[PDB]
């Protein structure tokens, strides 16, 4: 078996060498002749209150009006972002939740955490009460992120270093995605729902094929683990966030790392990332109570969304790009514009 | 709310806020604790691949919630930041092994120095004490695992049973071995409250109420400038 790692290292060196004869010019060279956006002035338009403990997750609805959030007091709340009303309030069986999702149709939500289960809730019932309809058991570690491919398909990320593709009607995994050595922490879908990315604590991000059920590509470059991952509107690029105050933008076909968005006045690590409707702004929530906004083409820090008094845990940009929502550990949600 | 239909939406939101207000009071009146240990340490006796379990006990009309982590992996670093709001941490140790004491000591060191576990005080139980006596009066030693036991003598020690002084010396040597780590740092933000716990030793729950009472009382003094 010792005569195998030599070849493995040789093949790894080939891969790097082959990728090395492609970086003719960095993005800055191309993009140095475009006028930047300058300054962005976004101020709070709404404040959502009613959570008891800290907030770990949220997800915008495709209506661009509704949203859902999760806190450790064991509660799900669905808001109305225009009139600041509350539409639903759902209590959980286990109070250590870590993630929430909204169906594209808008008929369902999901959540999970330190219980090794992903639950499904039905929003449209003949009786006026949100009820649990499917519990997905079979993971060995905690659930970190979940997203709905569609109404009957869901992809989950776990703390047992594996991902899975499920089938809500029967409740059995149809595919298991293995290969990560450290625990996966986040995932992002593609607009065509044919591919998805995922990051782990072993400082590696891998591309997976949903239909094939096999790894397709690998990306590297971070010193520390991966906290949150986001994906470009085209379907060609994806950007992530780590614990070392760094954020990149890797390409799929180029298979390498583009211009890096970092500054030297930031010491803490990122918690969540998101994109704008056109990819002209990159926003990331940090541990220093703030929420930075960057120029996604020229790596210029333009705009700071201050107003929280604790750690920013989540972000979100609506479908048509009108507003942004932020959650935090002081139990407040703020809608910017 | 200039419309009749919009009127009823505000009303429903108000009902939801009333329900949320009841929950806040209930949340406010409860104390959460985290339980940690190993396989040898019989923490289970003191108390379907599920991930966490919960146990509830009440003393003097006060509710305590104890969370025991179930089927998770060998890495602890990242799911431990969810517990930076608890009253205290209960650590259970099996002191009779001797050979595997290095691992409990290093787990204690990792827990005490954690970045997200600042201002969290720890309650220590030294479990299965009666088994140590039967393993030291008969004669496996401690010198072959800990060479500094031959230059240790019993200190303020109060051997309440008092049958053997050698048993007392070994007990308090283990106790000092554990308490050596606490004094190295922590700058008066969190404390350690050891106990010598027998296999059964059912005074455990009372020990917890008193320790929590002390922790909360000290916490406030610091806040008002009294300390």
């Amino acid at each position, epitope marked *: 078996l010792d005569q195998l790692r030599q070849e493995a290292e040789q093949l790894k060196n080939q891969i790097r060498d082959a990728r090395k004869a492609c970086a003719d010019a960095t993005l800055s060279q191309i993009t140095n002749n475009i006028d930047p956006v300058g300054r962005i002035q976004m101020r709070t338009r709404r404040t959502l209150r009613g959570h008891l403990a800290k907030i770990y997750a949220m997800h915008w609805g495709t209506d661009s009006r509704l949203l859902v959030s999760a806190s450790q007091d064991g509660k799900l709340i669905i808001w*109305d972002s225009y009139t600041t*009303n509350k539409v639903h309030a759902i209590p959980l069986r286990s109070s250590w939740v870590m993630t929430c999702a909204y169906a594209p149709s808008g008929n369902y939500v999901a959540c999970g955490g330190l219980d090794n289960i992903c639950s499904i809730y039905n929003l449209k019932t003949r009786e006026g009460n949100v009820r649990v309809s499917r519990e997905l058991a079979g993971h060995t570690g905690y659930l970190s992120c979940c997203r709905f491919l569609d109404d009957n398909q869901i992809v989950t990320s776990s703390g047992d270093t594996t991902c899975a593709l499920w089938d809500i009607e029967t409740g059995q995994q149809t595919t298991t995605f293995t290969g990560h050595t450290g625990d996966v922490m986040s995932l992002s879908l593609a607009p065509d729902t044919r591919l998805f990315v995922s990051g782990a604590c072993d400082a590696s991000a891998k591309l997976w094929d949903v239909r094939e059920g096999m790894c397709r590509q690998t990306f590297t470059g971070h010193e520390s683990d991966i906290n949150a991952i986001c994906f470009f509107p085209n379907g060609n690029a994806f950007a992530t966030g780590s614990d070392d105050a760094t954020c990149r933008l890797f390409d799929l076909r180029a298979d390498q790392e583009l211009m890096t968005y970092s500054h030297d006045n930031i010491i803490c690590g990122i918690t969540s990332v998101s994109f704008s409707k056109s990819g002209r702004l990159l926003l990331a929530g940090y541990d220093d109570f703030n929420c930075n906004v960057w120029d996604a083409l020229k790596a210029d820090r333009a705009g700071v969304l201050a107003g929280h008094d604790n750690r920013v845990s989540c972000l979100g940009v609506t479908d048509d790009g009108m507003a942004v929502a932020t959650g935090s550990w002081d139990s407040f949600l703020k809608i910017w514009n | 709310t200039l419309s*009749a*239909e919009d009127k009823a939406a505000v009303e429903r939101s*108000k009902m939801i806020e009333k329900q949320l207000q009841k929950d806040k009071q209930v949340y406010r009146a409860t104390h959460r604790l985290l339980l940690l240990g190993a396989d040898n340490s019989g923490k289970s006796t003191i108390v379907k691949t599920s991930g966490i379990f919960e146990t509830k006990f009440q003393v003097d009309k006060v509710n305590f919630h104890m969370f025991d982590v179930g089927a998770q992996r060998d890495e602890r670093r990242k799911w431990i930041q969810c517990f930076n709001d608890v009253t205290a941490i209960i650590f259970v140790v099996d002191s009779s092994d001797y050979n595997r004491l290095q691992e409990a000591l290093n787990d204690f060191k990792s827990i005490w120095n954690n970045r997200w576990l600042r201002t969290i005080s720890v309650i220590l139980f030294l479990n299965k004490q009666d088994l140590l006596a039967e393993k030291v009066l008969a004669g496996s030693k401690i010198e072959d695992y800990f060479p500094e036991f031959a230059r240790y003598t019993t200190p303020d020690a109060t051997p309440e049973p008092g049958e053997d002084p050698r048993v007392t010396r070994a007990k308090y040597f283990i106790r000092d071995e554990f308490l050596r780590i606490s004094t190295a740092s922590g700058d008066g933000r969190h404390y350690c409250y050891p106990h010598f716990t027998c296999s059964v030793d059912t005074e455990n729950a009372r020990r917890i109420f008193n320790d929590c009472r002390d922790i909360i009382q000290r916490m406030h003094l610091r806040q008002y400038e009294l300390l």
Partner: single-chain antibody, 232 residues
Framework: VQLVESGGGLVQPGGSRKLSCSASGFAFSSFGMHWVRQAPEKGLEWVAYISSGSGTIYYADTVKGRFTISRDDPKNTLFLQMTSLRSEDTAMYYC??????????????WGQGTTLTVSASADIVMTQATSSVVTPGESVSISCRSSKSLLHSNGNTYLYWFLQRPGQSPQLLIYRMSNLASGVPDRFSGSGSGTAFTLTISRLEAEDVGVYYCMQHLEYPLTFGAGTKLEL
């Protein structure tokens, strides 16, 4: 989701009756409850409204003080209290469910009602165009009319269609003038855009026979239309 009523009967003038509608099979403590009167030879008319939280109450302008309302969450039972019965106070009464949040569909589930036989203003006026008129396979168009702009500043248009079939209790076809109900076929559509409204039907089956009704939910009077029967 099924409801069974009680009460009714024939009461001599000047009497006192406690009419009731009893819920079962759903979260009755989260819906606002109505009561709607049906004249045997006329259309429908609304009488009162009780909210889920028992905080808001409206009454019919015709009868206000005499009638009383009450709900019982611990048993899921609704009541209407009627006193000093007059000649006009004899028709059919229907208990209608309704739940209000963003995207909801009020007036969706009705009961079946009961009867009560009696022996010897500035509200928006809503009117239909015709009263009766087809072939199984042709297209039908029914026109309603209003007297004030039903469009609000938010963007909503509070107009409903019901299709009370010849023999059973009413149902819901179109809520807010454009949207379709749950179990109705995808052959019905609402196309108003003016104080003049219309329900077009592409095909025509044997179940589509009945009388259509027109309602406005903009203000509390809840004035109805007149009705347009279709005959095979």
């Amino acid at each position: 989701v099924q409801l069974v009523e009680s009460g009714g009967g024939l009461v001599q003038p000047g009497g006192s009756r406690k009419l009731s509608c009893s819920a079962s099979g759903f979260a009755f403590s989260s819906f606002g409850m109505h009561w709607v009167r049906q004249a045997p030879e006329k259309g429908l008319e609304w009488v009162a409204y009780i909210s889920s939280g028992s905080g808001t109450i409206y009454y019919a302008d015709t009868v206000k003080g005499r009638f009383t309302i009450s709900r019982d969450d611990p048993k899921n039972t609704l009541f209407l209290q009627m006193t000093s019965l007059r000649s006009e106070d004899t028709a059919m009464y229907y208990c209608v469910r309704s739940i209000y949040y963003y995207g909801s569909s009020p007036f969706d589930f009705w009961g079946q009602g009961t009867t009560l036989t009696v022996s010897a203003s500035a509200d928006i006026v809503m009117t239909q165009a015709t009263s009766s008129v087809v072939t199984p396979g042709e297209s039908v168009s029914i026109s309603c009319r209003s007297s004030k702009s039903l469009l609000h500043s938010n963007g909503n248009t509070y107009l409903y269609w019901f299709l009370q079939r010849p023999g059973q209790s009413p149902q819901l076809l179109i809520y807010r003038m454009s949207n379709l109900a749950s179990g109705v076929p995808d052959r019905f559509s609402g196309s108003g855009s003016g104080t003049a409204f219309t329900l077009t039907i592409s095909r025509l089956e044997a179940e589509d026979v009945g009388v259509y009704y027109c309602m406005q939910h903009l203000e509390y009077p809840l004035t109805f239309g007149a009705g347009t029967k279709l005959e095979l």
